[PDB]
Amino acid sequence: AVKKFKPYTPSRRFMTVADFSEITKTEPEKSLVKPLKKTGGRNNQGRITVRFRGGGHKRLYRIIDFKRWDKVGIPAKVAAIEYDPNRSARIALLHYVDGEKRYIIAPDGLQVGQQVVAGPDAPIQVGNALPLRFIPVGTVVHAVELEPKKGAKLARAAGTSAQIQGREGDYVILRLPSGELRKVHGECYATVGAVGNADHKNIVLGKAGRSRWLGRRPHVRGAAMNPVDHPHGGGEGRAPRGRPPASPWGWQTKGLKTRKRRKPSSRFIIARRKK
Amino acid sequence: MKRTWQPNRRKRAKTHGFRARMRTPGGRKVLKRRRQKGRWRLTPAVRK
RNA sequence: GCGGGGUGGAGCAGCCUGGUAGCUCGUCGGGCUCAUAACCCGAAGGUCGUCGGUUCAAAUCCGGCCCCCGCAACCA
RNA sequence: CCGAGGGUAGGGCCCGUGACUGGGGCGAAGUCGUAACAAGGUAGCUGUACCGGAAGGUGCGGCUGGAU
RNA sequence: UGGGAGAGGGUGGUGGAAUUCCCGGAGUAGCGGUGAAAUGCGCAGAUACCGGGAGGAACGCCGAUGGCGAAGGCAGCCACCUGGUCCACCCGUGACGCUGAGGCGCGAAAGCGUGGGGAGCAAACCGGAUUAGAUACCCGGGUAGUCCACGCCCUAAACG
RNA sequence: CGAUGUCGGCUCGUCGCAUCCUGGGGCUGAAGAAGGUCCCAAGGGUUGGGCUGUUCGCCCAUUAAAGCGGCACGCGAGCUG
RNA sequence: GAAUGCCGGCAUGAGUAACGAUAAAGAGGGUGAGAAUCCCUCUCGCCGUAAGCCCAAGGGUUCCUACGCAAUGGUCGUCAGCGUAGGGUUAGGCGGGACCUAAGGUGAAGCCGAAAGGCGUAGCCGAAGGGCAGCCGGUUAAUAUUCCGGCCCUUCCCGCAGGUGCGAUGGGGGGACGCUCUAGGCUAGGGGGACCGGAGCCAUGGACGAGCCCGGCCAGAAGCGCAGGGUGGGAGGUAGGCAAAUCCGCCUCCCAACAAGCUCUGCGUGGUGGGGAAGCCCGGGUGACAACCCCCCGAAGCCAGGGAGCCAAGAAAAGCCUCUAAGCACAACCUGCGGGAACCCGUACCGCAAACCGACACAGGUGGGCGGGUGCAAGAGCACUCAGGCGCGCGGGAGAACCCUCGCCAAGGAACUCUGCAAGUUGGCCCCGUAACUUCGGGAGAAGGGGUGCUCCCUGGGGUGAUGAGCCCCGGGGAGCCGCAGUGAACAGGCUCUGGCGACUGUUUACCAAAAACACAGCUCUCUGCGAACUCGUAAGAGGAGGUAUAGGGAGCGACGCUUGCCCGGUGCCGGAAGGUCAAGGGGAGGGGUGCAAGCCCCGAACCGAAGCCCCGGUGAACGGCGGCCGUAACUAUAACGGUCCUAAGGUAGCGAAAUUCCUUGUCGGGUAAGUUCCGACCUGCACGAAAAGCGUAACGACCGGAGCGCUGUCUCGGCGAGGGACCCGGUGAAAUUGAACUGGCCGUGAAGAUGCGGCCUACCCGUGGCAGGACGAAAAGACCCCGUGGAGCUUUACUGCAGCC
RNA sequence: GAGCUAGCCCUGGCCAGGGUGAAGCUGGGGUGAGACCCAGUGGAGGCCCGAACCGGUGGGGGAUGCAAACCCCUCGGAUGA
Ligand SMILES: NC[C@H]1O[C@H](O[C@H]2[C@H](O)[C@@H](O[C@H]3O[C@H](CO)[C@@H](O)[C@H](N)[C@H]3O)[C@H](N)C[C@@H]2N)[C@H](O)[C@@H](O)[C@@H]1O
Ligand SMILES: [Mg+2]
Ligand SMILES: [Mg+2]
Ligand SMILES: [Mg+2]
Ligand SMILES: [Mg+2]
Ligand SMILES: [Mg+2]
Ligand SMILES: [Mg+2]
Ligand SMILES: [Mg+2]
Ligand SMILES: [Mg+2]
Ligand SMILES: [Mg+2]
Ligand SMILES: [Mg+2]
Ligand SMILES: [Mg+2]
Ligand SMILES: [Mg+2]
Ligand SMILES: [Mg+2]
Ligand SMILES: [Mg+2]
Ligand SMILES: [Mg+2]
Ligand SMILES: [Mg+2]
Ligand SMILES: [Mg+2]
Ligand SMILES: [Mg+2]
Ligand SMILES: [Mg+2]
Ligand SMILES: [Mg+2]
Ligand SMILES: [Mg+2]
Ligand SMILES: [Mg+2]
Ligand SMILES: [Mg+2]
Ligand SMILES: [Mg+2]
Ligand SMILES: [Mg+2]
Ligand SMILES: [Mg+2]
Ligand SMILES: [Mg+2]
Ligand SMILES: [Mg+2]
Ligand SMILES: [Mg+2]
Ligand SMILES: [Mg+2]
Ligand SMILES: [Mg+2]
Ligand SMILES: [Mg+2]
Ligand SMILES: [Mg+2]
Ligand SMILES: [Mg+2]
Ligand SMILES: [Mg+2]
Ligand SMILES: [Mg+2]
Ligand SMILES: [Mg+2]
Ligand SMILES: [Mg+2]
Ligand SMILES: [Mg+2]
Ligand SMILES: [Mg+2]
Ligand SMILES: [Mg+2]
Ligand SMILES: [Mg+2]
Ligand SMILES: [Mg+2]
Ligand SMILES: [Mg+2]
Ligand SMILES: [Mg+2]
Ligand SMILES: [Mg+2]
Ligand SMILES: [Mg+2]
Ligand SMILES: [Mg+2]
Ligand SMILES: [Mg+2]
Ligand SMILES: [Mg+2]
Ligand SMILES: [Mg+2]
Ligand SMILES: [Mg+2]
Ligand SMILES: [Mg+2]
Ligand SMILES: [Mg+2]
Ligand SMILES: [Mg+2]
Ligand SMILES: [Mg+2]
Ligand SMILES: [Mg+2]
Ligand SMILES: [Mg+2]
Ligand SMILES: [Mg+2]
Ligand SMILES: [Mg+2]
Ligand SMILES: [Mg+2]
Ligand SMILES: [Mg+2]
Ligand SMILES: [Mg+2]
Ligand SMILES: [Mg+2]
Ligand SMILES: [Mg+2]
Ligand SMILES: [Mg+2]
Ligand SMILES: [Mg+2]
Ligand SMILES: [Mg+2]
Ligand SMILES: [Mg+2]
Ligand SMILES: [Mg+2]
Ligand SMILES: [Mg+2]
Ligand SMILES: [Mg+2]
Ligand SMILES: [Mg+2]
Ligand SMILES: [Mg+2]
Ligand SMILES: [Mg+2]
Ligand SMILES: [Mg+2]
Ligand SMILES: [Mg+2]
Ligand SMILES: [Mg+2]
Ligand SMILES: [Mg+2]
Ligand SMILES: [Mg+2]
Ligand SMILES: [Mg+2]
Ligand SMILES: [Mg+2]
Ligand SMILES: [Mg+2]
Ligand SMILES: [Mg+2]
Ligand SMILES: [Mg+2]
Ligand SMILES: [Mg+2]
Ligand SMILES: [Mg+2]
Ligand SMILES: [Mg+2]
Ligand SMILES: [Mg+2]
Ligand SMILES: [Mg+2]
Ligand SMILES: [Mg+2]
Ligand SMILES: [Mg+2]
Ligand SMILES: [Mg+2]
Ligand SMILES: [Mg+2]
Ligand SMILES: [Mg+2]
Ligand SMILES: [Mg+2]
Ligand SMILES: [Mg+2]
Ligand SMILES: [Mg+2]
Ligand SMILES: [Mg+2]
Ligand SMILES: [Mg+2]
Ligand SMILES: [Mg+2]
Ligand SMILES: [Mg+2]
Ligand SMILES: [Mg+2]
Ligand SMILES: [Mg+2]
Ligand SMILES: [Mg+2]
Ligand SMILES: [Mg+2]
Ligand SMILES: [Mg+2]
Ligand SMILES: [Mg+2]
Ligand SMILES: [Mg+2]
Ligand SMILES: [Mg+2]
Ligand SMILES: [Mg+2]
Ligand SMILES: [Mg+2]
Ligand SMILES: [Mg+2]
Ligand SMILES: [Mg+2]
Ligand SMILES: [Mg+2]
Ligand SMILES: [Mg+2]
Ligand SMILES: [Mg+2]
Ligand SMILES: [Mg+2]
Ligand SMILES: [Mg+2]
Ligand SMILES: [Mg+2]
Ligand SMILES: [Mg+2]
Ligand SMILES: [Mg+2]
Ligand SMILES: [Mg+2]
Ligand SMILES: [Mg+2]
Ligand SMILES: [Mg+2]
Ligand SMILES: [Mg+2]
Ligand SMILES: [Mg+2]
Ligand SMILES: [Mg+2]
Ligand SMILES: [Mg+2]
Ligand SMILES: [Mg+2]
Ligand SMILES: [Mg+2]
Ligand SMILES: [Mg+2]
Ligand SMILES: [Mg+2]
Ligand SMILES: [Mg+2]
Ligand SMILES: [Mg+2]
Ligand SMILES: [Mg+2]
Ligand SMILES: [Mg+2]
Ligand SMILES: [Mg+2]
Ligand SMILES: [Mg+2]
Ligand SMILES: [Mg+2]
Ligand SMILES: [Mg+2]
Ligand SMILES: [Mg+2]
Ligand SMILES: [Mg+2]
Ligand SMILES: [Mg+2]
Ligand SMILES: [Mg+2]
Ligand SMILES: [Mg+2]
Ligand SMILES: [Mg+2]
Ligand SMILES: [Mg+2]
Ligand SMILES: [Mg+2]
Ligand SMILES: [Mg+2]
Ligand SMILES: [Mg+2]
Ligand SMILES: [Mg+2]
Ligand SMILES: [Mg+2]
Ligand SMILES: [Mg+2]
Ligand SMILES: [Mg+2]
Ligand SMILES: [Mg+2]
Ligand SMILES: [Mg+2]
Ligand SMILES: [Mg+2]
Ligand SMILES: [Mg+2]
Ligand SMILES: [Mg+2]
Ligand SMILES: [Mg+2]
Ligand SMILES: [Mg+2]
Ligand SMILES: [Mg+2]
Ligand SMILES: [Mg+2]
Ligand SMILES: [Mg+2]
Ligand SMILES: [Mg+2]
Ligand SMILES: [Mg+2]
Ligand SMILES: [Mg+2]
Ligand SMILES: [Mg+2]
Ligand SMILES: [Mg+2]
Ligand SMILES: [Mg+2]
Ligand SMILES: [Mg+2]
Ligand SMILES: [Mg+2]
Ligand SMILES: [Mg+2]
Ligand SMILES: [Mg+2]
Ligand SMILES: [Mg+2]
Ligand SMILES: [Mg+2]
Ligand SMILES: [Mg+2]
Ligand SMILES: [Mg+2]
Ligand SMILES: [Mg+2]
Ligand SMILES: [Mg+2]
Ligand SMILES: [Mg+2]
Ligand SMILES: [Mg+2]
Ligand SMILES: [Mg+2]
Ligand SMILES: [Mg+2]
Ligand SMILES: [Mg+2]
Ligand SMILES: [Mg+2]
Ligand SMILES: [Mg+2]
Ligand SMILES: [Mg+2]
Ligand SMILES: [Mg+2]
Ligand SMILES: [Mg+2]
Ligand SMILES: [Mg+2]
Ligand SMILES: [Mg+2]
Ligand SMILES: [Mg+2]
Ligand SMILES: [Mg+2]
Ligand SMILES: [Mg+2]
Ligand SMILES: [Mg+2]
Ligand SMILES: [Mg+2]
Ligand SMILES: [Mg+2]
Ligand SMILES: [Mg+2]
Ligand SMILES: [Mg+2]
Ligand SMILES: [Mg+2]
Ligand SMILES: [Mg+2]
Ligand SMILES: [Mg+2]
Ligand SMILES: [Mg+2]
Ligand SMILES: [Mg+2]
Ligand SMILES: [Mg+2]
Ligand SMILES: [Mg+2]
Ligand SMILES: [Mg+2]
Ligand SMILES: [Mg+2]
Ligand SMILES: [Mg+2]
Ligand SMILES: [Mg+2]
Ligand SMILES: [Mg+2]
Ligand SMILES: [Mg+2]
Ligand SMILES: [Mg+2]
Ligand SMILES: [Mg+2]
Ligand SMILES: [Mg+2]
Ligand SMILES: [Mg+2]
Ligand SMILES: [Mg+2]
Ligand SMILES: [Mg+2]
Ligand SMILES: [Mg+2]
Ligand SMILES: [Mg+2]
């Protein structure tokens, strides 16, 4: 439940930060962090290939376990719930009875001090991971592999979830957060429950500087540039688009579908996304 | 105000140095061209 | 300066592609109704801005004149 | 020292007036429609919301102070 | 103390009918709609029929002139949490009562904020008829809204 | 056009007279006073403000009067901008 | 002989401007052929969060000394960062290397690319980051944590003693981390002392004093003391830490927890070694057996990896500890001691500048540390000042106009002007007090006021110490004194009302624009199911992202409030398995060439045949668009009402002579004596209007308007004063420009604006200070305009390609 | 050619002093329990004033400059984008 500020400055009027109530441990497990090489949007050529990036807070990457089938049958205790700057969700510190320690993104409601476990015969309990084919139809689920043994790829953002709609052969039918209906293979793992921290979307950044701390350099409009720079560049005084609205590279940006038509996975999408 | 020459021995050596030249087709053509002209020094002198 | 226009009382067709002026409203005579409107049945009114020309023949094609909208009048 | 009061600055209440503007009341025979009284020709009234030259209309829910 | 009736309230579950959409089959020349029609939909295969799926909303019969609540109001079924109330016995306290300016709380619908949701319905809006006109009544579409959570609004033919 | 800096203001003036005032006149539908109209006359004089970049103009308060024009729409190797 | 030709030489301007911050000079004595300029002394002024001192970078002998004065030095020169010569830079401990990693670079493996080459795991390189052992003093003309003296320490080799399962590039711990706030105890640093030491001093009216002036320390191993930091012990199980593992991790059980114990740093002390002033005398000698003590203030530094809070969630690797593995346990490692060993490069000097970057001994630029005292509330602000360093490498006169910087002004007080431009006013602290409006924070330092010094007296609380004195810090009350004046000097808001634009802090056209522009949180559309979309790339590969629809791309709008209407015909985008069109390919009716012929060869219709286009739908916070004429009310006028034409549909809300209104200074009202601007209205809106958003909006603004108060040299209207120049003298000595010149006025003339022609008029020869009318003065082969079948940037439903995509 | 300039990356450093007083916490009042209110503590902020530092608002000087962008007076930011 988000936290407001009183208007003691112009920017505190609307600024809201997260309450951080589910957090129990306020420093990362040293054994599971590595330096995050900040890119600034640049690639190996040195070239900006994503505009308006750089200059945000230093971070340590927390190594998240996305293939929970690495430890089938070994229960783990939920030791802590920590803040991860590399994702919208929280993360849970797991002490396995193995003695091995791993992070997972924290589902919603997961309580520190519960045992979680992964595998085909595991319970249908928040935090347990199963092959999709063993989760009952209608169960919300997250951290869903897209292909078997390839890693949790779907539903990882705060408050996201995917609902199991039905099975069909070697494949179960998932409704992803986008509302798309997809056939994902039944041997793909998935952690039952929805991802936590659902209030994450209700955060009002509050000021320009906060966008900067998140690494987001200011964003200038095509309409603000010259024809050298943008389809919407130039003009005397202001100006409507004067052509169908377009990206800096010329291609149209209001409606133009960009999914590759002949993609092989088209065979496995049932219904394109809603809304 | 600040002018354009801000001398720096490391920068000078890592930019126009002999080895910076040899590592590159255009840099070895420099040395070749400067040798053929009979340049006394094929490369800036920088004291290190 | 360039563009379009002027036709029964009102607003519009017909001019391009020469012969024939049409649509709605209105107006007038009758019907219905106790009466009015509505509605129904009939009918009248335009020599086509004006003069000149082409022509067998001009609303129509070509000139001039009159009036009426529209666009333009930039570089110092 | 206090002190009538004079002065400088800022407030509060009241009154009169003001281009213009809003609705209101009233005034024999001007214009438009016909909402209501009969089931008034879509039963009516209603709180609310939106819309419309105007009475009003429509949605949602409510009342019988509704006919048969 | 022992008993009883009830859609009284809140929470979490969950069941069938139906409408809509979607996929499959079977199938052909219209369906729909009205006072009559038109718009609309339909040989790009609609309507009617069968199997499958998704989803929202409201709970048919029971149902009553019925029951419950202070009022607004509450109706599929199940469990939990909780309010009021009535009866028997005549056991306890011993006037501890009544009303109630202010106060505080509740308060249908529409409406507002932030999320979600969205099948049917449907202000606005578009179209078709009617009409002298028809910013209506009728018809075909259709967006807020109607639904959920939290927070507001606090109105009423909030009536016996 | 191998450059004659272009409005207005300010400063500095100087000339024309088709004279705004002051001086001298004629005619008057000149009683006086005050006007009208023309002639002669360039010696001197010809205000301070509100508005607008403004020149101009309207306006305020005066005045004997608040003249009109030329000098590269006088004057930026004098200022302003 | 001309090319604004090219190279060079020398002229002109001219003995002209200028000689580079207005911090400032004067005299005496030296030296020398020569002295404003060099040396010494005395006096004067200037910096003093530097204009002093120490590093780094860069510079590269500029350092020190001797001898020099041609050139360099904006003058001079005996001087010098200049010429010649000789000298000078000393390290196991400082810095860098023989250690470690960061971005990045490179790169066995591997991938990619016509060639060149591009990527890339490990590994390697890579530092101002991590790790690692030296402090104080003396000495030289010139080096010093480097030489010397004192007291400490590091690593390597070898040996001795004791100890131990020893052993690693492998496992593990640790190294190891942000921002803000901050406790306790110290140190740096500083103030005071009637105490200790000191050469002296008594002036000029007073003072022989508890007088003046000067100084009262630095470093130091073990031990010890104070303050901190780091740290549980044991046992059993064990399936994880890619072998093992007694370590680590996880579970369990016993004891220990603001402790203690162990360990580590800081500070104090500490054997010992140093230092030691003014003043006097010639860098030194004395002082001097110098004294070396007490109190206070006190860090931003130290203990430190301390504590609390917050969200934006805060390097790596080695050293180090620990676990074992091969091997080996005659080993090996650990500890203590001893002897030996310890290499390469830097070290001068400048270093906010005359030695670096700016062509210059250039008023500009340059990162880190120290930066003392007193007062002003604080402070690195301000004034003065210590140490220390300077007076800026032309001077002397004079006391014009004029220019710059500055000071003052009678009466008036914006009358100045595009504009209060500029300059006044205001100004610090403390106390009183403070409006509309508001998003409840604000507006607010609103506005406006009072106080402010010195002396005596009484009195309250803190810190230190001890509870007291002393010191130091906050206060309260009373009575007085002086001046024109008490933040007495210096630093230090003018205020109010009202509009436009933009929410706001931010950003921008380096060097004419700082704004209303960009950005901004926030809103919506849209694309993206992850080998995502999109971007860079021929590719490999990257970015996206070690992210996964509450995410990432693109686009518009731009806090917030209230809202955002109608049109899908045209364009775009989305949907559409039919139909139409459609290239290669399939097909081969049917022709043709040739051959004796089998055959070879060519053409070729029907029909099948993608995307695209056509066609059918949808779609506006997609591109965009949102009418005309005529009539009508019982005064007039106006038209709620009607007629008709056209459209895809005819502009809704709200705004409106506006950053938009042409006519226009619209009309009316307000404000003024007077208002083309301003504010409020009206609405025939030339030519507002709803995310190229509409209408508002508290707060914010070096934005742009209007008004008022204050106050003023802005002005009526100018005066006087100061200093720096201008002027005169000595020294040095430019510049653009220049056909040649023996270069007047008028009126004419002339290629139409004549010193140069004609006529007349005027005028002896040559300067100096001044002014700017002319030389169509200088400068720049007009930047406007035109021309050129000149060029370049941009656009598009111009043409033709190409990338990309289908 | 990024020793100027622009953006990013890695690693360090800098920001005198003064003011305002958010959340929270504590105590008290309040209630059925609350919300809430008062005080104290606390020390938030693209918060305020203002040096260093970063700027470059207006005006004046300068214009063969001290300077091919400088000087003076004034002004913006100064815990942050
Ligand atoms: N000209 C002068 C007259 O003017 C009014 O009279 C007029 C009314 O106003 C009209 O009434 C309308 O307006 C009312 C407002 O509600 C409605 O109720 C009513 N339904 C309407 O028809 C009515 N049509 C005509 C009548 N002559 C005065 O009253 C009358 O004294 C005076 O002499
Ligand atoms: Mg708060
Ligand atoms: Mg949380
Ligand atoms: Mg780490
Ligand atoms: Mg580790
Ligand atoms: Mg790279
Ligand atoms: Mg490269
Ligand atoms: Mg299979
Ligand atoms: Mg939101
Ligand atoms: Mg948000
Ligand atoms: Mg941004
Ligand atoms: Mg964004
Ligand atoms: Mg933008
Ligand atoms: Mg632009
Ligand atoms: Mg470009
Ligand atoms: Mg482009
Ligand atoms: Mg373009
Ligand atoms: Mg454009
Ligand atoms: Mg533009
Ligand atoms: Mg425009
Ligand atoms: Mg500068
Ligand atoms: Mg240069
Ligand atoms: Mg430098
Ligand atoms: Mg560099
Ligand atoms: Mg080669
Ligand atoms: Mg080459
Ligand atoms: Mg007609
Ligand atoms: Mg007509
Ligand atoms: Mg026609
Ligand atoms: Mg009739
Ligand atoms: Mg009828
Ligand atoms: Mg006729
Ligand atoms: Mg005619
Ligand atoms: Mg005739
Ligand atoms: Mg004929
Ligand atoms: Mg005729
Ligand atoms: Mg005719
Ligand atoms: Mg005529
Ligand atoms: Mg012009
Ligand atoms: Mg009184
Ligand atoms: Mg009196
Ligand atoms: Mg009196
Ligand atoms: Mg009458
Ligand atoms: Mg009538
Ligand atoms: Mg009705
Ligand atoms: Mg009726
Ligand atoms: Mg009715
Ligand atoms: Mg009735
Ligand atoms: Mg309506
Ligand atoms: Mg209306
Ligand atoms: Mg109408
Ligand atoms: Mg209407
Ligand atoms: Mg309606
Ligand atoms: Mg009711
Ligand atoms: Mg019982
Ligand atoms: Mg019972
Ligand atoms: Mg068919
Ligand atoms: Mg109920
Ligand atoms: Mg009984
Ligand atoms: Mg009884
Ligand atoms: Mg009893
Ligand atoms: Mg009793
Ligand atoms: Mg009793
Ligand atoms: Mg009451
Ligand atoms: Mg209610
Ligand atoms: Mg409701
Ligand atoms: Mg609302
Ligand atoms: Mg009809
Ligand atoms: Mg109609
Ligand atoms: Mg309608
Ligand atoms: Mg309607
Ligand atoms: Mg009832
Ligand atoms: Mg010219
Ligand atoms: Mg002029
Ligand atoms: Mg003047
Ligand atoms: Mg005349
Ligand atoms: Mg006389
Ligand atoms: Mg006479
Ligand atoms: Mg007479
Ligand atoms: Mg007279
Ligand atoms: Mg004269
Ligand atoms: Mg005029
Ligand atoms: Mg005139
Ligand atoms: Mg006028
Ligand atoms: Mg007179
Ligand atoms: Mg002229
Ligand atoms: Mg002129
Ligand atoms: Mg000029
Ligand atoms: Mg001028
Ligand atoms: Mg020349
Ligand atoms: Mg020349
Ligand atoms: Mg030459
Ligand atoms: Mg000469
Ligand atoms: Mg001269
Ligand atoms: Mg000079
Ligand atoms: Mg000088
Ligand atoms: Mg001087
Ligand atoms: Mg003598
Ligand atoms: Mg001598
Ligand atoms: Mg001599
Ligand atoms: Mg000082
Ligand atoms: Mg100095
Ligand atoms: Mg110096
Ligand atoms: Mg260095
Ligand atoms: Mg040099
Ligand atoms: Mg010399
Ligand atoms: Mg000489
Ligand atoms: Mg000389
Ligand atoms: Mg290395
Ligand atoms: Mg490479
Ligand atoms: Mg290093
Ligand atoms: Mg070292
Ligand atoms: Mg020393
Ligand atoms: Mg010697
Ligand atoms: Mg020394
Ligand atoms: Mg061992
Ligand atoms: Mg932070
Ligand atoms: Mg120390
Ligand atoms: Mg003594
Ligand atoms: Mg005496
Ligand atoms: Mg004595
Ligand atoms: Mg054991
Ligand atoms: Mg494992
Ligand atoms: Mg292992
Ligand atoms: Mg393993
Ligand atoms: Mg193992
Ligand atoms: Mg102990
Ligand atoms: Mg110990
Ligand atoms: Mg001695
Ligand atoms: Mg410090
Ligand atoms: Mg410091
Ligand atoms: Mg510091
Ligand atoms: Mg070696
Ligand atoms: Mg040295
Ligand atoms: Mg220096
Ligand atoms: Mg420095
Ligand atoms: Mg120097
Ligand atoms: Mg030099
Ligand atoms: Mg000099
Ligand atoms: Mg300098
Ligand atoms: Mg300091
Ligand atoms: Mg004092
Ligand atoms: Mg000294
Ligand atoms: Mg010096
Ligand atoms: Mg000087
Ligand atoms: Mg003189
Ligand atoms: Mg003289
Ligand atoms: Mg002068
Ligand atoms: Mg005065
Ligand atoms: Mg005054
Ligand atoms: Mg003006
Ligand atoms: Mg003004
Ligand atoms: Mg000013
Ligand atoms: Mg306040
Ligand atoms: Mg004040
Ligand atoms: Mg104000
Ligand atoms: Mg005094
Ligand atoms: Mg004490
Ligand atoms: Mg101030
Ligand atoms: Mg305006
Ligand atoms: Mg702004
Ligand atoms: Mg600010
Ligand atoms: Mg600029
Ligand atoms: Mg520039
Ligand atoms: Mg420039
Ligand atoms: Mg330039
Ligand atoms: Mg430039
Ligand atoms: Mg600004
Ligand atoms: Mg918004
Ligand atoms: Mg590309
Ligand atoms: Mg490509
Ligand atoms: Mg690729
Ligand atoms: Mg990644
Ligand atoms: Mg996102
Ligand atoms: Mg409001
Ligand atoms: Mg419409
Ligand atoms: Mg359309
Ligand atoms: Mg369409
Ligand atoms: Mg369309
Ligand atoms: Mg169409
Ligand atoms: Mg072809
Ligand atoms: Mg074909
Ligand atoms: Mg075909
Ligand atoms: Mg096709
Ligand atoms: Mg179509
Ligand atoms: Mg749009
Ligand atoms: Mg009439
Ligand atoms: Mg009509
Ligand atoms: Mg339509
Ligand atoms: Mg319009
Ligand atoms: Mg509308
Ligand atoms: Mg106007
Ligand atoms: Mg208007
Ligand atoms: Mg307009
Ligand atoms: Mg107005
Ligand atoms: Mg728009
Ligand atoms: Mg408001
Ligand atoms: Mg501004
Ligand atoms: Mg204006
Ligand atoms: Mg205006
Ligand atoms: Mg004042
Ligand atoms: Mg003056
Ligand atoms: Mg003077
Ligand atoms: Mg002539
Ligand atoms: Mg002539
Ligand atoms: Mg002439
Ligand atoms: Mg002279
Ligand atoms: Mg001249
Ligand atoms: Mg030319
Ligand atoms: Mg032009
Ligand atoms: Mg041109
Ligand atoms: Mg051509
Ligand atoms: Mg051309
Ligand atoms: Mg750079
Ligand atoms: Mg740069
Ligand atoms: Mg701030
Ligand atoms: Mg400036
Ligand atoms: Mg600057
Ligand atoms: Mg500027
Ligand atoms: Mg100036
Ligand atoms: Mg100033
Ligand atoms: Mg200023
Ligand atoms: Mg500030």
Author numbering:
A (entry chain 1D): 2 to 276
B (entry chain 17): 1 to 48
What do the authors of the reporting publication say about this deposited model?
The majority of antibiotics inhibit protein synthesis by targeting the ribosome, the molecular machine responsible for decoding messenger RNAs (mRNAs) and correspondingly incorporating incoming amino acids into the nascent polypeptide chain. The most common clinically used aminoglycosides harbor the central 2-deoxystreptamine (2-DOS) ring joined by glycosidic linkages with amino sugars. They interfere with protein synthesis by targeting the region of 16S ribosomal RNA (rRNA) helix h44 forming the decoding center within the 30S subunit of the ribosome (inset 1). Binding of 2-DOS-containing aminoglycosides to the decoding center displaces two universally conserved nucleotides, A1492 and A1493, promoting their interaction with the minor groove of the codon-anticodon duplex in the aminoacyl (A) site of the ribosome. AMK is synthesized by the addition of the 4-amino-2-hydroxy butyrate (AHB) group at the N1 amino group of the 2-DOS moiety of kanamycin A (KAN).
The crystal structures of the Thermus thermophilus 70S ribosome in complex with mRNA, tRNAs, AMK or KAN were determined at ~2.9 Å resolution by molecular replacement using a high-resolution model of the 70S ribosome with the tRNA and mRNA ligands removed (see “Methods”). The initial difference Fourier density maps calculated using the Fobs – Fcalc amplitudes revealed, as expected, clear unbiased density for AMK or KAN in the canonical aminoglycoside binding site in helix h44 of 16S rRNA (inset 1). In addition to binding to h44 near the decoding center, KAN binds to three secondary sites in the T. thermophilus 50S subunit. One KAN molecule interacts with helix H88 located in domain V of 23S rRNA, the other KAN contacts helices H40 and H42 in domain II, and the third KAN is found at the base of the A-site finger helix H38, interacting with helix H85 and with Lys8 of protein uL16. While these secondary binding sites are not likely to be physiologically relevant and probably the result from the high concentration of drug used during crystallization, they nevertheless enrich the catalog of interactions between small molecules and RNA. The hydroxymethyl in ring III and the amine in ring II are within hydrogen-bonding distance of the non-bridging oxygen atoms of P-site tRNA A73 and C2254 of the P-loop, respectively, and the amine of the AHB group forms multiple H-bonding interactions with G2252 of the P-loop. The interactions mediated by the AHB group of AMK with the P-loop likely contribute to the binding of AMK to this site because KAN, which lacks the AHB moiety, does not bind to the P site of the 50S subunit. The AHB hydroxyl group and the chemical moieties decorating ring III form multiple interactions with ribosomal protein uL14 residues Tyr7, Glu45, Glu54, and the main chain carbonyl oxygen of Lys44.
